[PDB]
């Protein structure tokens, strides 16, 4: 029904800590602006209007930080905790949730205020300003699609049936349609329908010393970028994060974490921006993907 705001220390990560700024002890109220400012570069010559390129500018969100605590000790402990937790991580992801959507914004602490105007049992009523890194993006699960063989029908499918030594008839419209393909289980498509900007993939390699990773193809079947690694031993999994702010390319074997950046193929990795098409798995047995895609206004 009502909206939900949730501050995350590290989303997409094991060391995550979530603060409910809607229901918890420390709450965010009356956001300054959730919209957007656009600058279209319009120049008019003799009454006729010419439009350039629109630079969609995102403005600082200023909240109304309010703590609810049983004692003065409790609210001072809340301010020291919530702020340090935002300061501890270089950037904090604010989740925007409503009946219809679940968007996210990457924020950086711009300004926080601490004053001595306490209410009852020493309760804070302050202004918390944030700088926009990325405004509104959808964090969703990306999975491959499987292809299944069509059913075999007498007269419709290519088979030599009925009276010996078989018969298939050329009709008009119904004629002969191939049932499927021998070993249809080989075909798998990791479909990309809209342009994505960053992702958190968990890749499980097959063979050691053979380049292992992912490659991306466009609408015409041409490779534009590829994250691939040539390791000496089989890693249990290669944890990759394409996020610009905290780029991670690490391999895991047992309880040991290895940085795989120098072993990576630098020539194939041309871009981070993934375009409309499909994704292929190079020397991978299994893969788990989480795709984050931007939305200007939500």
Binding region for another protein (CB under 8 A): 244, 247, 249, 254, 256, 258-259, 261-262, 266-267, 269-270, 272
CA gap 22, 3 in Å, rounded: 8
Q: What residue 173 binds from Ca ion, another protein, none (CB within 5 to 8 A, per partner kind)?
A: none
CA gap 254, 82 in Å, rounded: 34
Q: What residue 249 binds from another protein, Ca ion, none (CB within 5 to 8 A, per partner kind)?
A: another protein
By 3-state DSSP, what share of the chain in percent is helix, strand and coil, each rounded to 5?
A: 10, 45, 50
Q: Which is nearer to another protein, 7 or 214 (CB)?
A: 214
Q: What residue 269 binds from Ca ion, another protein, none (CB within 5 to 8 A, per partner kind)?
A: another protein
Q: What residue 247 binds from another protein, Ca ion, none (CB within 5 to 8 A, per partner kind)?
A: another protein
**Closest Cα to residue 63, out of 15, 26, 18?**
26
**3-state SS assignment for residue 177:** strand
Q: Are 152 and 158 in contact (CB under 8 A)?
A: no
CA gap 165, 95 in Å, rounded: 67
Q: What residue 122 binds from Ca ion, another protein, none (CB within 5 to 8 A, per partner kind)?
A: none
Q: Which is nearer to another protein, 18 or 234 (CB)?
A: 234
Q: Which is nearer to Ca ion, 13 or 155 (CB)?
A: 13
Query: Cβ atoms within 10 A of the Cβ of 42, count?
Result: 10
Q: Which is nearer to another protein, 93 or 198 (CB)?
A: 198
Closest separation in Å from C-beta 226 to another protein = 12
Closest separation in Å from C-beta 93 to Ca ion = 8
Closest separation in Å from C-beta 211 to another protein = 15
- Within 157-229, strands assigned E span 188-192, 198-205, 212-218, 223-229
**Closest Cα to residue 264, out of 281, 277, 245, 251?**
251
Closest separation in Å from C-beta 214 to another protein = 16
Q: Which is nearer to another protein, 272 or 290 (CB)?
A: 272
Closest separation in Å from C-beta 148 to another protein = 39
Q: Which is nearer to another protein, 75 or 198 (CB)?
A: 198
Site for Ca ion in 9-28 (CB under 5 A): 10, 12-13
What are the Cα distances from residue 257, in Å, to 229, 252, 253?
15, 5, 7
CA gap 244, 239 in Å, rounded: 15
Closest separation in Å from C-beta 266 to another protein = 4
- In the complex, the residues that contact Ca ion under the rule CB under 5 A are 10, 12-13
């Amino acid at each position: 029904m009502v909206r939900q705001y949730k501050i995350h220390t590290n989303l997409d990560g094991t060391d995550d800590k979530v603060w409910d700024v809607t229901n918890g002890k420390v709450r965010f109220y009356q956001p300054s602006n959730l919209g957007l400012q656009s600058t279209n570069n319009i120049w008019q010559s003799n009454g006729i209007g010419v439009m350039g390129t629109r630079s969609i500018t995102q403005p600082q969100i200023e909240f109304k930080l309010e703590t609810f605590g049983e004692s003065l000790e409790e609210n001072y402990q809340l301010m020291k905790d919530f702020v340090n937790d935002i300061l501890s991580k270089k950037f904090v992801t604010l989740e925007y949730q409503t009946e219809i959507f679940q968007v996210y914004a990457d924020l950086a602490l711009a300004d926080v205020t601490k004053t001595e105007g306490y209410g009852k049992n020493g309760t804070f009523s302050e202004k918390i300003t944030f700088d926009i890194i990325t405004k509104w993006y959808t964090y969703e699960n990306l999975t491959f699609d499987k292809i299944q063989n069509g059913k075999v029908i007498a007269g419709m499918s290519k088979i030599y049936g009925g009276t010996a030594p078989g018969n298939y008839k050329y009709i008009k419209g119904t004629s002969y349609t191939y049932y499927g393909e021998s070993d249809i289980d080989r075909l798998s498509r990791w479909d990309i329908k809209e342009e994505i900007f960053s992702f958190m993939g968990i890749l499980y390699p097959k063979l050691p010393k053979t380049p292992a990773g992912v490659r991306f193809l466009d609408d015409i079947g041409n490779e534009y970028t590829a994250i691939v690694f040539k390791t000496e031993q089989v890693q249990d999994y290669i944890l990759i994060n394409t996020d610009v702010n905290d780029e991670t390319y690490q391999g895991w074997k047992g309880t040991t974490a290895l940085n795989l950046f120098p072993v990576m193929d630098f020539e194939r990795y041309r871009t981070r921006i993934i375009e409309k098409g499909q994704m292929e798995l190079i020397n991978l047995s299994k893969a788990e993907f989480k795709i984050k895609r931007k939305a200007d206004f939500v």
